[PDB]
RNA sequence: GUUUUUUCACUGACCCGGUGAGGCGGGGGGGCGAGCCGGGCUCUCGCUUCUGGCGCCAAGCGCCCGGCCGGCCGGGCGCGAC
RNA sequence: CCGACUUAGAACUGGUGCGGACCAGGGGAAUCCGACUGUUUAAUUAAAACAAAGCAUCGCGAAGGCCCGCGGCGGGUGUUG
RNA sequence: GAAAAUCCGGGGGAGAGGGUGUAAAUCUCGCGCCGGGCCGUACCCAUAUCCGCAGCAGGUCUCCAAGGUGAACAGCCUCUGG
RNA sequence: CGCAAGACGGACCAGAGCGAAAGCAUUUGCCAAGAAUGUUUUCAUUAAUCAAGAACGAAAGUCGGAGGUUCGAAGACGAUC
């Protein structure tokens, strides 16, 4: 379910509210904001353990997207490259239920 | 009357090698406790250019198991080995690539490569830039591996004795073509005084067995006997067979 | 859910305390316009006490185990959160935003704190905030 | 950052607090790389915890 | 505008070497001048610093790579063959 | 029996390699798979692989022993590390 | 209001003289040789000779190939494979 | 696309200091006190102090570098100096 | 009896299937694609055929690297003549 996830996250971009980026998704986290997390595979080792351990204290659901950031970014829908997307919000959208 | 280039190479003096800015030798890591008896971590420090050599070394700094001292090894570093990557090193070290264990204790197809020949030597075959040899066979009784060498050559090898698991780095060098002679200048600038080759018939017959003649000729076969004095043995040195090299 | 309370331990991540372990004692995680950023007082140890061993007189045992504490507040971000908390009063009017505009209020807040973390190290409660991270 | 560039030999006359910074680390590691080894001395030392816990619970049924 | 019909980076090399020389050595001299992207990072950074041995300009990540190329041939088969007797040794 | 001779393997001259000659070889103790109704055998393994931290100069527990006035003040020795 | 170097175009003008000295490639059509740059007989030969990249043979898996040394548990290639 | 002398910063925390003082150990802060030996040092450095038998049209490693013309450290003319 | 290497995928294999053609046959996994059928889905003429232009294109052949079991242009011989 790798098609899913992609169609998913493009429902997202259109209605919910979401935090593309490391710092900035790092304070929705800790303020308690954040429902979902979103890393790609090529993360510094330090960020995914420190995104892990942020989430295990905010009790956040931590994904881990099957591509590295250049993948991630362009299933955000956008021209640039995304290391951690934190989801504020899904919208009227499915990747927190399944 | 005169000694030939190659007699005149062994004193040294002038056909040394230039070792001045060698970093290092490119040694695999001593055997010890853990290396014998399970496996020992150490990080890639940074991936290194060696003057002379091809393949890059890779810097990798292990902790000494008995004093609070830091030990600082130079392997062959393997292609696709990383720095801030944890080389680990022994018996129950994992099969993957820039990990040293034991040959016996890897299965049959497994490339390797500064792989000891003698064990505990620190690591000799295949250590050249792109090479690598293929473990084929085990033999428990008498405790011994075939290994095919880079040659081609298969040679039966004592299974305790170690290598890095994957080929060398620097590799496919030798399909550049060197456009201009000053390319080779500044490549045995590096190595040792060998390079502008000047062939023995443009030689005198005083400085070469081939040399003089209002020719430019030989006028003695090229091949020559393995038991041939020093000075006289030179062209093909007991060729086997000589022309196109046809068939395999 | 939220997790940056008055009770958490944090790991000091930047600064001079670098790498120190202190307790939160407020968090204002809306800033307001003094400190605009999400930011939290905290009270730290500076010097940690010294490792202490069976036969060491009653008097050396006293010398070693004395904290060094200090005040401060920090961003949220030259903080590094951990699930531990040490459930030490450190009183809202003595340690206090009201501290660091009098130096005479800090030095009391900096005793206050020094008292309170000696008194709970001796206990042996909450002895991983009494280590030093080992970095 | 807070050292100054000179040369070697000088650094006897200059001052303690011309040399370094006043942090762990300061004047011979970056701010950068020493909050990367609060974090990474910290979550190494975290992970090895649950390591410890998952060990002694693998244990209990057999 | 195209400079050049037929040669690239070997327009360097005027006359001098041979046609196929020149050639054989274009396909060559495109790879290792060419910028790479970090595996790493995702930045197009791998620039290579020497034979064997490539540098990320951002990560500050080096990798022993090949002589002309980020990767070889050979060790992209070596590393997919080398993972596979891993998964049987380990079972 | 005496002695020649070929083939196996022996180490102890002789040789090579490594190392700061740092755990070799046996035996003991402890772990799991295998086995007969609390017992023991035929065996096995020996603590570190998610991260570009830290790691030495002993903790602990035994065992002895030197003032003041049994209760207050310091060293040695084992085991830990068979 | 401060401008600092040029460029293009025009008029007029001199006994057609003007890159006025200085500085400063004769050109073309062909043959032979060596691809080229490089090198060479200091003091008669700078060449078509040598070198060169490319090409192709050969030896050698180290107790090894090649080589040195009166000698050695010697030495160079070799901080090599 | 050098080594080493040399110098510094840091991690650690064995120790050390004194019982509220005439504080103590300790200070890479500011001042003050004392010392620094031995050897070379002139001049030429080149159409005349060097090497070519010589005040030899040869050779012999560097540094500084005005105005005009001009692409120019070209040539040609000029100032300082000679 | 073993061992090694590189080819090839018999029988099943059909006037059967698939693909734009060239072509495609051991097992299993992975990748994206596709016709046909089914359709009370959707868009609503978006289509057909096409100078220039473009993708693919058996075998042989050429270039560089690895390999070379069998067959085998050239070549050598034995026959036949």
Redesign the interface.
């Known amino acids: 379910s790798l098609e899913s996830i992609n169609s998913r996250l493009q429902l997202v971009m259109k209605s919910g509210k979401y935090v593309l980026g490391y710092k900035q998704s790092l304070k929705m986290i800790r303020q308690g904001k954040a429902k979902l997390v979103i890393l790609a595979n090529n993360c510094p080792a330090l960020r995914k353990s420190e995104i892990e351990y942020y989430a295990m204290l905010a009790k956040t659901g931590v994904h881990h997207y099957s591509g590295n950031n250049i993948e991630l970014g362009t299933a955000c829908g956008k021209y640039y490259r995304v290391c951690t997307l934190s989801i504020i919000d899904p919208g009227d959208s499915d990747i927190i239920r399944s | 009357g005169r000694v030939i280039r190659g007699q005149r190479k062994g004193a040294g003096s002038v056909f040394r090698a230039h070792v001045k800015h060698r970093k290092g030798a490119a040694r695999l890591r001593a055997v010890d406790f853990a290396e014998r008896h399970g496996y020992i971590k150490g990080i890639v420090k940074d991936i290194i250019h060696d003057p002379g050599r091809g393949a890059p070394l890779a810097k990798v700094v292990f902790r000494d198991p008995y004093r609070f001292k830091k030990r600082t090894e130079l392997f062959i570093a393997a292609e696709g080995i990383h720095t801030g990557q944890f080389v680990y090193c022994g018996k129950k070290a994992q099969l993957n690539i820039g990990n040293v264990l034991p040959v016996g204790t890897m299965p049959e197809g497994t490339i390797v490569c500064c792989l000891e020949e003698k064990p505990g030597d620190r690591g000799k075959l295949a250590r050249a830039s792109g090479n690598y040899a293929t473990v084929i066979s085990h033999n428990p009784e008498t405790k011994k591996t075939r290994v095919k060498l880079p040659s081609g050559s298969k040679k039966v090898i004592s299974s305790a004795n170690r290598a890095v698991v994957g080929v060398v780095a620097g590799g496919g060098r030798i399909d550049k073509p060197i456009l201009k002679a000053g390319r080779a200048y500044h490549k045995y600038k590096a190595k040792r005084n060998c390079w502008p080759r000047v062939r023995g018939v443009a030689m005198n017959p005083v400085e070469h067995p081939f040399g003089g003649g209002n020719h430019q000729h030989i006028g003695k076969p090229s091949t020559i006997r393995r038991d041939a004095p020093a000075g006289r043995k030179v062209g093909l040195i007991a060729a086997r067979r000589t022309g196109r090299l046809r068939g395999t | 859910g939220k997790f940056m309370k008055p009770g958490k331990v944090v790991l000091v991540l930047a600064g001079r305390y670098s790498g120190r372990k202190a307790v939160i004692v407020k968090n204002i995680d809306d800033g307001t316009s003094d400190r605009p950023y999400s930011h939290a007082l905290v009270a730290g140890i500076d010097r940690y006490p010294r490792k202490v061993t069976a036969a060491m007189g009653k008097k050396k045992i006293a010398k070693r185990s004395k904290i060094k504490s200090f005040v401060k507040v920090y961003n949220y971000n030259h903080l590094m959160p951990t699930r531990y908390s040490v459930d030490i009063p450190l009183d809202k009017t003595v340690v206090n935003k009201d501290v660091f505009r009098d130096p005479a209020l800090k030095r009391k807040a900096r005793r206050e704190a020094k008292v309170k973390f000696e008194e709970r190290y001796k206990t042996g409660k909450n002895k991983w905030f009494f280590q030093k991270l080992r970095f | 950052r807070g050292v100054r560039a000179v040369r070697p030999k000088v650094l006897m006359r200059l001052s303690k607090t011309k040399k370094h910074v006043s942090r762990a680390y300061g004047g011979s590691m970056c701010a950068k790389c020493v909050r990367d080894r609060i974090k990474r001395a910290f979550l190494i030392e975290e992970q090895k915890i649950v390591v410890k816990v998952l060990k002694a619970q693998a244990q209990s049924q057999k | 505008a195209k400079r050049t019909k037929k040669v690239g980076i070997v327009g360097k090399?005027g006359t001098?070497?041979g046609a196929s020389?020149?050639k054989?050595?274009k396909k060559?001299e495109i790879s290792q001048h060419a910028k790479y992207?970090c595996?790493?990072?995702?930045?197009t950074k791998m620039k290579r610093?020497?034979?064997?041995?490539w540098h990320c300009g951002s990560c500050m990540?080096?990798?022993?790579?090949?002589?002309?190329?980020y990767?070889?041939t050979?060790?992209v088969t070596?590393?997919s063959?080398?993972?596979r007797?891993?998964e049987?040794?380990?079972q």
């Open positions: 090399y001098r070497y020389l020149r054989m050595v060559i992207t595996s790493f990072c995702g930045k610093r020497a034979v064997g041995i990540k080096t990798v022993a790579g090949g002589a002309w190329t990767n070889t050979s060790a070596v590393k063959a080398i993972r007797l891993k049987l040794k380990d």
